[PDB]
Amino acid sequence: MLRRKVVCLNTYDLVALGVGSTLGAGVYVLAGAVARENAGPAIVISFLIAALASVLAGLCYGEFGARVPKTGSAYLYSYVTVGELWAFITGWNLILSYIIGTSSVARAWSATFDELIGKPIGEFSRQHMALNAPGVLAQTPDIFAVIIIIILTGLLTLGVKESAMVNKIFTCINVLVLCFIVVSGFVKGSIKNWQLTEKNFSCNNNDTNVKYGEGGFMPFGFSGVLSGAATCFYAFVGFDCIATTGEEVKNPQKAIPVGIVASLLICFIAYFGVSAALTLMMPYFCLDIDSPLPGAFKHQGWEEAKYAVAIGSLCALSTSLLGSMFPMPRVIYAMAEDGLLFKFLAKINNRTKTPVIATVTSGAIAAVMAFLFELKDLVDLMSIGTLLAYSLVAACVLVLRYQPEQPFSLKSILSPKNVEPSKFSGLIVNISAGLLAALIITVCIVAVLGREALAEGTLWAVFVMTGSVLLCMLVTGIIWRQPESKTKLSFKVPFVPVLPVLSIFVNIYLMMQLDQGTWVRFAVWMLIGFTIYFGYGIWHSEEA
Amino acid sequence: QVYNITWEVTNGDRETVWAISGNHPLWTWWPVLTPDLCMLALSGPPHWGLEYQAPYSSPPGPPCCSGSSGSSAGCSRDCDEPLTSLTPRCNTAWNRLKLDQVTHKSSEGFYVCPGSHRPREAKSCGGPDSFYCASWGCETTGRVYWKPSSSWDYITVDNNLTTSQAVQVCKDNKWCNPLAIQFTNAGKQVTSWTTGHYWGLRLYVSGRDPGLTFGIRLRYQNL
Ligand SMILES: *[C@@H]1O[C@H](CO[C@@H]2O[C@@H](C)[C@@H](O)[C@@H](O)[C@@H]2O)[C@@H](O[C@@H]2O[C@H](CO)[C@@H](O[C@@H]3O[C@H](CO)[C@@H](O)[C@H](O[C@H]4O[C@H](CO)[C@@H](O)[C@H](O)[C@@H]4O)[C@@H]3O)[C@H](O)[C@H]2NC(C)=O)[C@H](O)[C@H]1NC(C)=O
Ligand SMILES: *[C@@H]1O[C@H](CO)[C@@H](O[C@@H]2O[C@H](CO)[C@@H](O[C@@H]3O[C@H](CO)[C@@H](O)[C@H](O)[C@@H]3O)[C@H](O)[C@H]2NC(C)=O)[C@H](O)[C@H]1NC(C)=O
Numbered sequence A: 001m002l003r004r005k006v007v008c009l010n011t012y013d014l015v016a017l018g019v020g021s022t023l024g025a026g027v028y029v030l031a032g033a034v035a036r037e038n039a040g041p042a043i044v045i046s047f048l049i050a051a052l053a054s055v056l057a058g059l060c061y062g063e064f065g066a067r068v069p070k071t072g073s074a075y076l077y078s079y080v081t082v083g084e085l086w087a088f089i090t091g092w093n094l095i096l097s098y099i100i101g102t103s104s105v106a107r108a109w110s111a112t113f114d115e116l117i118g119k120p121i122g123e124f125s126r127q128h129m130a131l132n133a134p135g136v137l138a139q140t141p142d143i144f145a146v147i148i149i150i151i152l153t154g155l156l157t158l159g160v161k162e163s164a165m166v167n168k169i170f171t172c173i174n175v176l177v178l179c180f181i182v183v184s185g186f187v188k189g190s191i192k193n194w195q196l197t198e199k200n201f202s203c204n205n206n207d208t209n210v211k212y213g214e215g216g217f218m219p220f221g222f223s224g225v226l227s228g229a230a231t232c233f234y235a236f237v238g239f240d241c242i243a244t245t246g247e248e249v250k251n252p253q254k255a256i257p258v259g260i261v262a263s264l265l266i267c268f269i270a271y272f273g274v275s276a277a278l279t280l281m282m283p284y285f286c287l288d289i290d291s292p293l294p295g296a297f298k299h300q301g302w303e304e305a306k307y308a309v310a311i312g313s314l315c316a317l318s319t320s321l322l323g324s325m326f327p328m329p330r331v332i333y334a335m336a337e338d339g340l341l342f343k344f345l346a347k348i349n350n351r352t353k354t355p356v357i358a359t360v361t362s363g364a365i366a367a368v369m370a371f372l373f374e375l376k377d378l379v380d381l382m383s384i385g386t387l388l389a390y391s392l393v394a395a396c397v398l399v400l401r402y403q404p405e406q407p408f409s410l411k412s413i414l415s416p417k418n419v420e421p422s423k424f425s426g427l428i429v430n431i432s433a434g435l436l437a438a439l440i441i442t443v444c445i446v447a448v449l450g451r452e453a454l455a456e457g458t459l460w461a462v463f464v465m466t467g468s469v470l471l472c473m474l475v476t477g478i479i480w481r482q483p484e485s486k487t488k489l490s491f492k493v494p495f496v497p498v499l500p501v502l503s504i505f506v507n508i509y510l511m512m513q514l515d516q517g518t519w520v521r522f523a524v525w526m527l528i529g530f531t532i533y534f535g536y537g538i539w540h541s542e543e544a
Numbered sequence B: 001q002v003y004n005i006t007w008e009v010t011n012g013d014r015e016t017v018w019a020i021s022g023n024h025p026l027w028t029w030w031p032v033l034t035p036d037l038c039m040l041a042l043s044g045p046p047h048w049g050l051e052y053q054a055p056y057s058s059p060p061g062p063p064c065c066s067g068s069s070g071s072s073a074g075c076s077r078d079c080d081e082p083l084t085s086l087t088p089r090c091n092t093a094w095n096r097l098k099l100d101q102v103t104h105k106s107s108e109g110f111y112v113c114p115g116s117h118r119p120r121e122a123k124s125c126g127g128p129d130s131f132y133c134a135s136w137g138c139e140t141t142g143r144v145y146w147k148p149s150s151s152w153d154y155i156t157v158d159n160n161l162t163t164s165q166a167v168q169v170c171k172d173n174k175w176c177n178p179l180a181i182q183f184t185n186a187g188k189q190v191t192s193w194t195t196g197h198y199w200g201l202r203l204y205v206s207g208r209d210p211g212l213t214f215g216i217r218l219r220y221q222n223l
């Protein structure tokens, strides 16, 4: 099941596109939630970790898009290079990423707008609607998010495309608002909010069930910081639009990686500054559940600034929302045309010259997801899928670096005399990659499920941990000794035997940091995808 | 003759943090001293979080709204959330729950080493900076898996309450780590309690193994 397919914007334009597609909905809404529940004032470190992993992923994309001339989503590159099943998994994960990102950003947009106008829509929803599933479904069904998704799907079906000028304007407004937030945090905020103790564990409001934690800079510990990093990984998603951009690029394979990295660095700087401001102006446990940044501004007396923020957020979210919506029908259409998904989804309509059916179906799914589930649950469900997709791309890069160009003894495996990759070396690298992926999954399982056991130093946990880590190093060395393909690439991952492996490890660890419900939702989604592939994908594949 | 005897338990600063009184003949009343592990830390080492708390001060930290008093504005839900990420100390109710867990876990606990009253042969155990526990084998009592004991140390220290008994006391925002200190025979024959004796109690955990210094002494007056 590995059939393989037969295959101007400047750097600044790509940077602007990535920044516009990444900044919103992760800093304006989820930053406060992470700083209150998962990370505390140490959320600054979380954004760092989520940044680094993201950068690694981006670097993989730089190579992963360099191996294929036709610019497109990671699904296209996988289906061209590695095969059909792998590409289907990657495309299905990207579909989940786009759908749940649309749902979550629509939730954030609806919540922000409703809060701005005094939360009348929330009162209406609570009055006339109730899901009666508090443990899984959302307390308040976001009807306005559904309306937003319906309107935007209607616009997309009619042929509305990426307006670069409007994106640039909104990104400039967003960046100005973020700079204002950082400056106001460093002016009004104080370091004492990072040094809170039991004396200050008293919010001036009358909130109940407050989590005060240890206090200080890291109230919830490094486990909390890691959970916050896993949640904040959602904030760095969106740079894919750089590589998948429809418009022709002046220097595609050279500008795409630099643009992705620069966008990620700018987003990391913005997130660090804004989160430090948010946690310095207001105590982490005092952060408002609904409007963290406006709540912090009101706490320090600059309540009027809530309007300015209300502007920037509503800009950023918009630029993020479309950033999640435009790719959403494209990947589905690409997969349906290739036969992996139902062929009817590939029917471009003559009235509009757009994939009407795919757009409508994806929009309806996103609207339902936004109607039924909370913002945090959607964020985690998108993060797990995006992490899996990035790990898949990193594994593709690692494997393909050692495969021979398209047409035994222990010493031979350890020391391959061949100057260039032979099919034996390619098979060795494939086996090593599979073993390393399984072993990294085992390491993360022991490091999370057995985290307390490792802290307790039980014999079995330590034995498995040391064995798995040493064998991971051994397999990485096995891959290292294999010759790399001499096929010249415009962009390459610097340390191909280590960097992709580290990217996979960090990604899988972050996925392990996610909750059980997120894993159950991801498992049922993957079951649906596998059912579709094995029942329809294999037999109706276009390349069959 | 009968005196109004009083047994005083003090922090490392020699300030009385707990006491029990009764009319008894001298050197004939040896009650089980039940000072809370946190009172010993009042004005003690910075780790316990009571370095600025005077003796007999009320337990700090907001109340758990799992507590008997019920949900109130500003409650801490940490007392319900997992204690894995917390530090064992006394500055908050949930930190006190974590301290109780550490003090009751079989793989963890606390150990107590003697101070100046130890024999000169034990002088290698170090001074107060080491809590008299510079090396293993210096500990004479306390609750750990290897159950240290001494035939010459004056006291034995255990936990007065089980985890189930102490959890709800912690959730009530009360002092909820009561030690149980029983005079050994050697302590009973000894009569230098007027000058006071001192011990160092250290948590047996992974890392710092933070500890404090406490002391026991006797007072008496005609009555
Ligand atoms: C037998 O002796 C005890 C002990 O007396 C105390 O110790 C002696 C060594 C000597 O230094 C005495 O001077 C000293 O008091 C007697 O118990 C004491 O009784 C008095 C009378 O009430 C207590 O006075 C205090 O009054 C405060 C009012 O402002 C009150 O807040 C105190 O309660 C709090 O503080 C005490 C300690 O400060 C603490 O133990 C309490 O639990 C509470 O937090 C307190 O009532 C002394 O504090 C008592 N001392 C104790 C209990 O150690 C006893 O009366 C005496 N019996 C006879 C028959 O004479
Ligand atoms: C430390 O440990 C001691 C001993 O385990 C605890 O003392 C015990 O306290 C309980 C409740 O205060 C006593 O129960 C009571 O018994 C009487 C009858 O004697 C009954 O009428 C009451 O209704 C109540 O059930 C128990 O007897 C008592 N045990 C002893 C040996 O004194 C003490 O509470 C623990 N905590 C502290 C801070 O000391």
Ligand SMILES: CC(C)CCC[C@@H](C)[C@H]1CC[C@H]2[C@@H]3CC=C4C[C@@H](OC(=O)CCC(=O)O)CC[C@]4(C)[C@H]3CC[C@]12C
Residues within 6 Å of the ligand: A020, A147, A148, A151, A161, A162, A163, A164, A166, A167, A170, A318, A319, A320, A321, A322, A323
């Ligand atoms: C009864 C209804 C009409 C209630 C009121 C809500 C609408 C007036 C709002 C809800 C969502 C809004 C949309 C949300 C996002 C955008 C994208 C925005 O464009 C960009 O951000 C361009 C950047 C890019 O393409 O990435 C232009 C405004 C628009 C269409 C908004 C227009 C006004 C809308 C439809």
Ligand SMILES: CC(C)CCC[C@@H](C)[C@H]1CC[C@H]2[C@@H]3CC=C4C[C@@H](OC(=O)CCC(=O)O)CC[C@]4(C)[C@H]3CC[C@]12C
Residues within 6 Å of the ligand: A049, A052, A053, A055, A056, A222, A223, A451, A502, A503, A506, A509
């Ligand atoms: C962009 C290039 C040039 C550098 C890439 C560096 C990364 C591969 C490094 C930098 C920081 C590292 C992280 C720093 C800390 C941790 C926590 C570590 O887990 C713990 O320490 C858990 C401890 C506990 O149980 O409390 C797991 C690896 C991880 C995510 C590391 C994974 C590898 C990272 C991302």
Ligand SMILES: *[C@@H]1O[C@H](CO)[C@@H](O[C@@H]2O[C@H](CO)[C@@H](O)[C@H](O)[C@H]2NC(C)=O)[C@H](O)[C@H]1NC(C)=O
Residues within 6 Å of the ligand: A192, A193, A197, A199, A200
């Ligand atoms: C947390 O509480 C402490 C204790 O009240 C505050 O520290 C005091 O702050 C006042 C300001 O009114 C000063 O006058 C005191 O000198 C401070 N004492 C100490 C020991 O720090 C602290 O400011 C509070 N933190 C916040 C962020 O409000």
Ligand SMILES: NCCC[C@H](N)C(=O)O
Residues within 6 Å of the ligand: A021, A022, A023, A024, A025, A026, A027, A101, A102, A105, A234, A235, A236, A237, A238, A319, A320, A321, A323, A324
């Ligand atoms: N626009 C793509 C969705 C993810 C994005 N980082 C966000 O913060 O919503």
